[PDB]
């Protein structure tokens, strides 16, 4: 009856996500505004309140997809996730844009009224970016073609969704009040921002030589992202315009990674503890080991996904012989094991 | 009594700002269509013909907004479509015949009313063929759609599902309107309007300072320019009158903030009112927002990003704050060096 305040929504997100406060507020505000719009569906005012789509930009592994999954748990309206890569322009073998609404209907029991007020997430939106360098000779059905088909969907159109099979009987869903959240790990966008901001070049005496250290980081550059930068990446102005709200996720730091190992509800350390717990052994990760794991992952530049690789390598040998071993009760992992100067100590008993 | 074009233009002003040619062409076109409906019999020997309109304008100019406003004050059936979803006959994609099907549904299957209506086709620039060269690989969503609509816009008989008795409907008296952004058309116009731009003393070098703007450049658009951008000449003929919207200016944007009946400021003010808090937008703050919006190049759509960006923090914590009664948005908040003043009741 009472719409949850954004603070409560953010608290729930923190249970699974660690950091990205700016993105959390945008998502919480969007849900609060969407709920208010739904609660005010009768338009008890003198205006036709519009929507504001979000664009979750950030380095791979920052938690863009994770946020969408967590939102679907605390959401009250229908929710659905999509993949821009499979989408293709109408009239081709590839999947059509209208398929997104079909999935949303399944979550709403094929209720047009319910599906007309849900939320939708489109992951890998950066992949459909038009190949600006490529000549405008062959229609980019997989890229620019998909963006052009989503212009009316985001703004609002009577999408034709199949009526659960086989012309006629085609359902008519209006995507006017549906909220869309696009996400994608834009690769190379930082360079575009650097040229527009750094503007450091030249070889002559009257030039401005810049040191490699003065160069900013991807996170810093991405923070100062502007729509002009997206145009060079491959996004048409008609597409970015429909997405006025833009959120940026910073690059997880070493300290933040240490929290990911445990703080998240399904944190990496907890996942491996259950694996060992069901087998009858206790798994403990020393705080010192977590620091080394985070440091190694910081170099792989693979986000939180790099943490799993470090744990697997350290526990690869243990998981190969531990099941055959007997009387093993607990396994302790120290920083030395992460570096390779020791092996996990086995507490027999 | 049929309404005069001035009345139609006045209604469009309530929701649109800074668009004279668009309103005039639409009002005149609608006025002519209304007169044709009044004399549908056309007893007079002369067989009065129709003139379709083509809308050209940058993003956030009001092309899709004008069509929506027209459907409210209109009396005959109206329909909106998307050229991207359309495809030539015999393919999984949507067919052009479905356009009349939606129009027929809006008239409760009234063929008489369907034969006299208006149809708006958005994203017409999308179907534009990538290149004017021969289509080695048939463009199902490109030339195919244009060729399929050649007879529909000009006028012919179309077969639509009854509800294989495909109901026959004539499209000779139905008005069709097309709209698109045509990203890059300005370059084509410049290549034609501007010539002799190369290296040399006798050549001309604008330096980008004197170069014509996108808005005025499109105002000088000619049919030949559209051919280079990619469009079948047969399709251009079906659209004799071409309306070109101008890029909104800083002053024009400031008016769109509040003048529209459903302006952005009003929408945000109503949103806070529904929660229980009052919102006030200062005139000085509006100008600052317009300046930043004019730099995004996204048209009116950029205003929503600036407003929500400044109110992002406020809307996140305002629902928790108690006793707050009104918020004052000053120009300092727009730049980001200040926080919206909070008034505690
Ligand atoms: N802040 C975070 N808190 C908790 N887990 C996180 C966080 N960031 C990333 N993860 C982990 O990331 C994994 C999911 O990948 P994630 O959603 O981060 O990728 P992505 O950035 O959306 O990918 P893409 O490269 O396709 O754009 C999950 O295991 C989740 O635990
Ligand atoms: N002059 C204007 N006054 C008020 N609102 C405007 C104006 N121009 C655009 N808008 C806003 O534009 C939105 C509707 O989209 P619009 O018709 O501008 O699209 P467009 O620029 O033609 O898009 P595209 O060319 O990509 O199809 C509405 O939110 C409307 O408020
Ligand atoms: Mg992802
Ligand atoms: Mg439009």
């Amino acid at each position: 009856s009472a719409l949850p305040t954004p603070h409560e929504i953010r608290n729930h997100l923190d249970d699974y996500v660690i950091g990205q406060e700016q993105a959390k507020k945008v998502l919480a505000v969007a849900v609060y505004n969407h709920y208010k719009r739904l609660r005010n569906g009768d338009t008890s005012n003198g205006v036709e309140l519009g929507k504001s789509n979000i664009l979750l930009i950030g380095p791979t592994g920052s938690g863009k997809t994770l946020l969408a999954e967590t939102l679907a748990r605390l959401l009250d309206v229908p929710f659905t996730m999509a993949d821009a890569t499979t989408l293709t322009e109408a009239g081709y073998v590839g999947e059509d844009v209208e398929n997104i609404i079909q999935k949303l209907l399944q979550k709403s029991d094929y209720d047009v009224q319910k599906a007309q007020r849900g939320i939708v997430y489109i992951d890998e939106i950066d992949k459909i970016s038009r190949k600006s360098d490529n000549p405008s000779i062959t229609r980019d059905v997989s890229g620019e073609g998909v963006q052009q088909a989503l212009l009316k969907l985001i703004e609002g159109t009577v999408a034709a969704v199949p009526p659960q099979g086989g012309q006629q009987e085609f359902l008519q869903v209006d995507t006017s009040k549906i909220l869309f959240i696009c996400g994608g790990a834009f690769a190379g966008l930082d360079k575009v921002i650097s040229h527009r901001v750094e503007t450091g070049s030249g070889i002559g005496f009257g030039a401005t030589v810049k040191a490699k250290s003065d160069k900013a980081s991807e996170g810093e550059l991405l923070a100062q992202v502007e729509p002009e930068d997206l145009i060079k990446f491959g996004l048409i102005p008609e597409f970015i315009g429909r997405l006025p709200v833009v959120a940026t996720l910073n690059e997880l730091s070493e300290e933040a990674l240490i929290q990911i190992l445990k703080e998240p509800k399904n944190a990496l350390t907890k996942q491996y503890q259950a694996l060992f717990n069901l087998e009858g052994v206790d798994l403990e990760f020393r705080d010192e080991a977590l620091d080394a794991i985070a440091k190694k992952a910081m170099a792989r530049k693979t986000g939180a996904r790099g943490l799993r690789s470090i744990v697997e390598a350290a526990l690869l040998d243990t998981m190969y012989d531990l099941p055959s071993m007997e009387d093993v009760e607990k396994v302790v992992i120290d920083e030395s094991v992460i570096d390779g100067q020791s092996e996990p100590l086995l507490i027999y008993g």
Side-chain angles (χ1 to χ4, degrees), chain A:
Chain A
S1 179
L3 306 183
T5 56
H7 281 272
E8 298 179 358
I9 291 165
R10 184 177 180 276
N11 299 130
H12 194 295
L13 297 172
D14 299 0
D15 302 333
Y16 299 84
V17 190
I18 307 296
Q20 313 297 358
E21 178 171 2
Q22 192 67 231
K24 285 166 171 172
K25 291 187 293 182
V26 174
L27 299 175
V29 167
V31 172
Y32 192 66
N33 302 135
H34 193 95
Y35 286 4
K36 278 163 58 174
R37 292 155 184 169
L38 167 53
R39 278 280 296 278
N40 189 78
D42 68 77
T43 50
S44 64
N45 53 23
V47 302
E48 295 179 356
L49 296 172
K51 73 197 188 191
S52 60
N53 301 271
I54 308 93
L55 178 60
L56 302 175
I57 298 168
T60 183
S62 300
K64 300 183 290 296
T65 311
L66 172 62
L67 286 161
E69 301 180 4
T70 60
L71 206 71
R73 314 192 187 189
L74 61 90
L75 271 165
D76 302 330
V77 304
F79 188 90
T80 298
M81 302 180 66
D83 188 5
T85 54
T86 192
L87 301 176
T88 305
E89 190 175 4
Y92 282 74
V93 301
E95 185 175 347
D96 294 359
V97 171
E98 295 85 357
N99 282 284
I100 295 165
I101 311 308
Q102 187 176 11
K103 298 173 181 175
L104 187 65
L105 285 163
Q106 297 181 136
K107 306 297 189 303
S108 318
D109 299 330
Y110 290 94
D111 291 0
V112 176
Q113 296 295 352
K114 300 293 297 307
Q116 283 176 0
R117 55 174 66 91
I119 316 297
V120 173
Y121 181 74
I122 298 166
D123 193 1
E124 321 303 7
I125 197 72
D126 60 324
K127 311 310 190 305
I128 56 165
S129 59
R130 184 189 73 266
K131 301 296 184 181
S132 179
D133 48 14
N134 178 265
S136 297
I137 180 59
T138 304
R139 195 171 303 277
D140 189 358
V141 300
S142 67
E144 186 185 7
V146 184
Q147 299 188 57
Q148 296 169 352
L150 295 159
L151 302 179
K152 296 288 289 186
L153 188 74
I154 303 299
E155 188 181 7
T157 185
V158 187
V161 303
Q164 302 147 51
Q167 179 190 323
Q168 273 188 46
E169 197 180 11
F170 280 23
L171 268 167
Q172 304 304 297
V173 176
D174 181 64
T175 68
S176 179
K177 310 307 300 182
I178 295 173
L179 186 69
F180 300 85
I181 299 165
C182 298
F186 290 74
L189 185 66
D190 56 358
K191 298 185 180 61
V192 176
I193 298 161
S194 70
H195 293 66
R196 182 174 62 87
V197 182
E198 303 296 348
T199 185
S201 61
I203 310 300
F205 298 89
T208 57
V209 304
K210 193 68 63 174
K212 306 302 97 174
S213 63
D214 292 359
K215 304 302 185 182
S217 178
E218 47 264 18
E220 302 179 359
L221 293 162
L222 291 162
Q224 304 177 134
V225 66
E226 293 295 351
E228 286 67 44
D229 307 323
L230 299 174
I231 291 166
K232 312 302 294 302
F233 191 87
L235 299 189
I236 56 171
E238 295 78 357
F239 180 67
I240 55 172
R242 265 82 179 186
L243 308 176
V245 179
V246 175
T248 60
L249 281 68
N250 306 117
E251 188 176 3
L252 300 176
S253 57
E254 187 176 359
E255 197 286 337
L257 294 171
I258 292 162
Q259 308 300 339
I260 299 286
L261 271 306
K262 56 202 188 290
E263 297 291 356
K265 267 182 61 56
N266 317 302
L268 190 66
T269 69
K270 294 175 176 175
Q271 286 176 340
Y272 286 103
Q273 285 173 0
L275 192 70
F276 282 62
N277 281 121
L278 67 88
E279 195 268 330
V281 178
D282 293 328
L283 187 62
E284 184 183 9
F285 287 95
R286 294 290 184 175
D287 295 330
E288 293 177 350
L290 308 188
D291 304 334
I293 294 164
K295 197 188 302 307
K296 298 175 73 66
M298 280 290 294
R300 295 169 59 87
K301 65 166 62 58
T302 47
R305 288 148 178 166
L307 303 173
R308 189 170 296 273
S309 62
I310 307 304
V311 176
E312 286 289 356
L315 308 182
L316 167 54
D317 299 71
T318 302
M319 283 182 291
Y320 163 75
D321 56 359
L322 175 54
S324 65
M325 294 194 179
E326 303 296 348
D327 84 11
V328 188
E329 298 182 357
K330 189 171 184 177
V331 178
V332 176
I333 296 87
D334 181 65
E335 179 177 358
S336 59
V337 176
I338 306 303
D339 301 1
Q341 294 300 320
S342 172
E343 311 299 346
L345 192 151
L346 276 62
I347 299 293
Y348 308 99

